[PDB]
Amino acid sequence: VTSHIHLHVPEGATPKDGPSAGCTIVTALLSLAMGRPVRQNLAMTGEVSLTGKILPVGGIKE
Amino acid sequence: LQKQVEKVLRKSAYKIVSGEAESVEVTPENLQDFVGKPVFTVERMYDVTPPGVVMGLAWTAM
């Protein structure tokens, strides 16, 4: 709630698929809130809906 | 819908030429192996609306 934060999201993703990283961001912040490193060898993609529901994303195969 | 029906007809033609089937009597049970599995499964985002979220109708460009 009270901490100025800077996040770097590497570029390359087409803007249409950019929101697919939103879910990631969430957990990242959560980790930085409790200092628990995210479990290694874990991938995740999805779009957050401001309430928790995750929307489908394209480019699943690539 | 035009794209999907064109895909189904193309696969029917291919099966008629290659598969040598005289005719294609398409039924939903067969449909799964022509177009694949359904991309859309849930009509709405929220089947049940949690607090603070409300669905509203929008007149968009398309």
Swiss-Prot record, chain A:
Effect after changing residue 45 to V: Enhances the basal, but not the stimulated ATPase activity
The organism's place on the tree of life at top rank: Eukaryota
Domains (record comment): The Lon N-terminal domains are crucial for the overall structure of the protein, maintaining it in a conformation allowing its proper functioning.
Function in brief: ATP-dependent serine protease that mediates the selective degradation of misfolded, unassembled or oxidatively damaged polypeptides as well as certain short-lived regulatory proteins in the mitochondrial matrix. Endogenous substrates include mitochondrial steroidogenic acute regulatory (StAR) protein, DELE1, helicase Twinkle (TWNK) and the large ribosomal subunit protein MRPL32/bL32m. MRPL32/bL32m is protected from degradation by LONP1 when it is bound to a nucleic acid (RNA), but TWNK is not. May also have a chaperone function in the assembly of inner membrane protein complexes.
Organ and tissue specificity: Duodenum, heart, lung and liver, but not thymus.
Outcome when changing residue 59 to A/S: Enhances the basal, but not the stimulated ATPase activity, and retains peptidase activity
Mutagenesis or variant effect for residue 20 to A: Lacks both ATPase and protease activity, but retains DNA binding activity
Subcellular location: Mitochondrion matrix
Active-site residues, Swiss-Prot/TrEMBL: 20
SUBUNIT field: Homohexamer. Organized in a ring with a central cavity. The ATP-binding and proteolytic domains (AP-domain) form a hexameric chamber, while the N-terminal domain is arranged as a trimer of dimers. DNA and RNA binding is stimulated by substrate and inhibited by ATP binding. Interacts with TWNK and mitochondrial DNA polymerase subunit POLG.
UniProt disease annotation: CODAS syndrome: A rare syndrome characterized by the combination of cerebral, ocular, dental, auricular, and skeletal features. These include developmental delay, craniofacial anomalies, cataracts, ptosis, median nasal groove, delayed tooth eruption, hearing loss, short stature, delayed epiphyseal ossification, metaphyseal hip dysplasia, and vertebral coronal clefts.
Protein name (Swiss-Prot/TrEMBL): Lon protease homolog, mitochondrial
Family: Belongs to the peptidase S16 family.
